[PDB]
Amino acid sequence: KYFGTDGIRGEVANSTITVEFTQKLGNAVGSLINQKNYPKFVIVGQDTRSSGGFLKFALVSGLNAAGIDVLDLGVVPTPVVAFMTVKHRAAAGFVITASHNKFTDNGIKLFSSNGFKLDDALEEEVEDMIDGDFIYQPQFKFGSYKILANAIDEYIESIYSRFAKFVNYKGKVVVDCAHGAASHNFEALLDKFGINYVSIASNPDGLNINVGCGATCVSNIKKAVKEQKADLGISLDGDADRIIIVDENGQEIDGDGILNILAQYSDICGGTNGIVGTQMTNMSYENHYRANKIPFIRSKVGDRYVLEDLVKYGYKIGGESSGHVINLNFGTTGDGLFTAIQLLAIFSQADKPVSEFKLQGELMQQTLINVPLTKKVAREDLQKVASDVNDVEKRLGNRGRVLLRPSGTEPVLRVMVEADDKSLATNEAEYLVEKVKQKL
C-alpha cells in the first residue's frame, strides 16, 4: 500500500519515494487516463525541496511514455496546481511535495480533473496499476513536456479580480513563507494589492524548507511580529495549503479561529449555508456558531473528510485546526494564499486591530490522558464506557465535552476532555480514565 494516511510521502531513498516508484506512478496515472479516455494532458508543480526536480522528471518520463503531455508550473503552491488543473482541461494534477514535513522528505499529491484530491477508490485504482506492468503508448504517440512561463500569473489575477474591490489594508504584515513554494509567489500576490509586508522566510536553498519556520513553527512569526512591531503575521507551510496567522500582540490565531472570522464575513468570502470543522475544533467556536444561528458540522477529523462533508451538505467554507482552510466558492483544496487575501479583505472592513476580529473570551482548554492498554480496541469495547461519557457531558453541559479515540496502530486509548475550566477538564478526564480501566 502506497497512499494511506498522508498519501505518498516519505524520506527520499529511504522510503517509497524512490526514483523508480515515482516513474511507475506517473505511468500508472497515465494508463488510467488512457483507459478512461480523458485528456492526454496533465499539470505538474513542486515546492522548493532540491529532490523535487529529479522526482518530477521521474514522474514525467512515466507520463510521457504513457502518451500524456505535461505542462510544468515549476515552483508553485499546491493550490495553484489544483487551480490550473480545473481552469485548463487537464486530466489530473501532480505536486511534488511533502507539505509541512522535514526537508529530507518528499512525496506526491494527486488531483483529479475536477481539482479535488484523489478519493479512496481512485487511490486504489492507481495502486493496482502501479503493481501492474509499465505500459508504453501502443501507437508510439508519446507525450511532450513544456514549462509554462510566468506560471503564477493566472492564479494571481484570478484572486486579484475577485478581491481588489475589498482589499484596502494599510497595516504592516510579516510574511513567513517557510522557505517553501509560496516564496516569491506570495509576495507577488501581495504587491498586486499594494500591501505593506516584510518577508522572513522566502529564501529557499533546496534544504531549508520548514526549518524553524512556516506554519508548523508559529514561534517564528510570533517573534517577528513583536520584533517588527507589525499589525499582522501570516505564516504558511511548505506547499502553502496550510495557514496560521498572529495578531498585533503576537497572539496565534489557528485554523479554527481563522474559519470563525471568515464565517463572520461569509458574504465577502462568497457565501455559505454552514461551516464544516472537525472533531478537534474548539467548542468555544461551536458555541459561537450556535449563538449566531450558523450551522456547524464536526467532520470525521482531517484528510479529505472536511471536503467530503462540505460537498455533502452544500457548504462552502470549511477548515481544520492545523490551518487547512477550504473555500469552495473559489478553490477545491486548502489554500493559504487565498485565505490570506480573504482575511486581508476582512481586516479592511473595520478600523480596529486584528485581535478585535478574533473570537472574544478565553478559549476552552484541553486535558488529554493517554490510557495505556495491553489489548486491542473495537467498537463494542467503546460502547461499554458510553454511559460514562454521557454522564460527564451531561454534567459539563455547554461548558465542555468529551472525545474518546483509539490508536488503531497501538493498544492505546486517548481520553480527552475540553472545558471552560481546565481544573475541571483534568478532573473529568481522570474520572473517565478510571472508568475505562474498570470496564476494559
Instruction: Kindly calculate the radius of gyration of the chain based on its CA atoms and give it in whole angstroms.
Output: 23
From Zn ion, a copy of itself, none, interface partner of 241 (C-beta below 5 to 8 A by class): Zn ion
Residue from the set 8, 25, 42, 60 that interacts with a copy of itself by CB under 8 A: 60
Nearer to a copy of itself, 147 or 368 (CB): 147
Nearer to a copy of itself, 60 or 201 (CB): 60
Please report how the helices 336-346 and 255-264 are oriented relative to each other, as an axis angle in degrees rounded to 10. 50
- Taking the CA atoms of residue 81, residue 261, residue 354 and residue 174 in that order, the dihedral angle to the nearest 10 degrees is -10
Q: Closest separation between CB of residue 241 and Zn ion, Å?
A: 4
Q: Is 219 annotated as a binding residue?
A: no
Is position 34 an interface residue for a copy of itself (rule: CB under 8 A)? no
What are the φ and ψ backbone dihedral angles of 423, each rounded to 5 degrees? -55, -35
Q: Closest separation between CB of residue 28 and a copy of itself, Å?
A: 13
Q: Closest separation between CB of residue 36 and Zn ion, Å?
A: 28
The SS3 assignment for 23 reads helix
Residue nearest to Zn ion (CB): 99
Is position 113 an interface residue for a copy of itself (rule: CB under 8 A)? no
Taking the C-alpha atoms of residue 18 and residue 10, their distance in angstroms, rounded to an integer, is 9
Nearer to Zn ion, 99 or 113 (CB): 99
Is position 29 an interface residue for a copy of itself (rule: CB under 8 A)? no
Grid coordinates of 366: 484541553
Taking the C-alpha atoms of residue 218 and residue 176, their distance in angstroms, rounded to an integer, is 9
Q: Closest separation between CB of residue 370 and a copy of itself, Å?
A: 34
Amino acid residing at 430: E
Nearer to a copy of itself, 106 or 321 (CB): 106
Residue from the set 31, 46, 48, 64 that interacts with a copy of itself by CB under 8 A: 64
From a copy of itself, Zn ion, none, interface partner of 237 (C-beta below 5 to 8 A by class): Zn ion
Q: What are the CB-based long-range contacts (under 8 Å, 24+) for 379-383?
A: 381/440, 382/406
Interface contacts to Zn ion, rule CB under 5 A? 99-100, 237, 239, 241-242
Q: Which of 31, 99, 112, 113 is catalytic?
A: 99
Nearer to a copy of itself, 136 or 356 (CB): 136
Stretch that binds a copy of itself, among 46-54, 233-241, 258-266, 274-282 (CB under 8 A): 46-54
What are the φ and ψ backbone dihedral angles of 351, each rounded to 5 degrees? -90, 60
> Residue 36 burial by CB count (10 A; 0-12/13-18/19+): exposed, middle or buried?
exposed
Percent composition of the chain: helix, strand, coil (DSSP 3-state, to 5):
35, 20, 45
Taking the C-alpha atoms of residue 265 and residue 342, their distance in angstroms, rounded to an integer, is 9
Residues 286-315 interacting with a copy of itself (rule: CB under 8 A) = none
Q: Are 62 and 22 in contact (CB under 8 A)?
A: yes
Q: How far is CA 301 from the centre of its chain?
A: 12
Q: How far is CA 243 from the centre of its chain?
A: 8
Any residues with CB less than 8 A from the CB of 216 and at least 6 apart, and which?
Answer: 100, 178, 210, 237, 242
Is position 211 an interface residue for a copy of itself (rule: CB under 8 A)? no
Residue from the set 89, 119, 144, 368 that interacts with a copy of itself by CB under 8 A: 144
Taking the C-alpha atoms of residue 375 and residue 24, their distance in angstroms, rounded to an integer, is 39
- Could you identify the residue written with the cell 512561463? 149
Residue from the set 13, 188, 350, 386 that interacts with a copy of itself by CB under 8 A: 13
Is position 150 an interface residue for a copy of itself (rule: CB under 8 A)? no
99 is catalytic: yes
Is position 31 an interface residue for a copy of itself (rule: CB under 8 A)? no
Stretch that binds a copy of itself, among 54-62, 113-121, 188-196, 328-336 (CB under 8 A): 54-62
Q: Are 365 and 425 in contact (CB under 8 A)?
A: yes
Grid coordinates of 85: 488543473
From Zn ion, a copy of itself, none, interface partner of 173 (C-beta below 5 to 8 A by class): none
Q: Is 241 annotated as a binding residue?
A: yes
* DSSP track, 242-298: -EEEE-TTS-EE-HHHHHHHHHHTTTTTT--S-EEEETTS-HHHHHHHHHTT--EEE
Is position 23 an interface residue for a copy of itself (rule: CB under 8 A)? yes
From a copy of itself, Zn ion, none, interface partner of 239 (C-beta below 5 to 8 A by class): Zn ion
For a copy of itself (CB under 8 A), the number of binding residues is: 34
Q: Are 296 and 317 in contact (CB under 8 A)?
A: no
Q: Is 256 annotated as a binding residue?
A: no
Nearer to a copy of itself, 42 or 159 (CB): 42
> Residue 6 burial by CB count (10 A; 0-12/13-18/19+): exposed, middle or buried?
middle
Nearer to a copy of itself, 137 or 282 (CB): 137
Grid coordinates of 348: 479592511
Q: Which residues are annotated as a binding site for Mg(2+)?
A: 99, 237, 239, 241
Q: Which residues are catalytic?
A: 99
Q: Which residues bind a copy of itself (CB under 8 A)?
A: 12-13, 18-20, 23, 27, 50-51, 53-58, 60-65, 103-104, 134, 136, 140-145, 147, 206-207
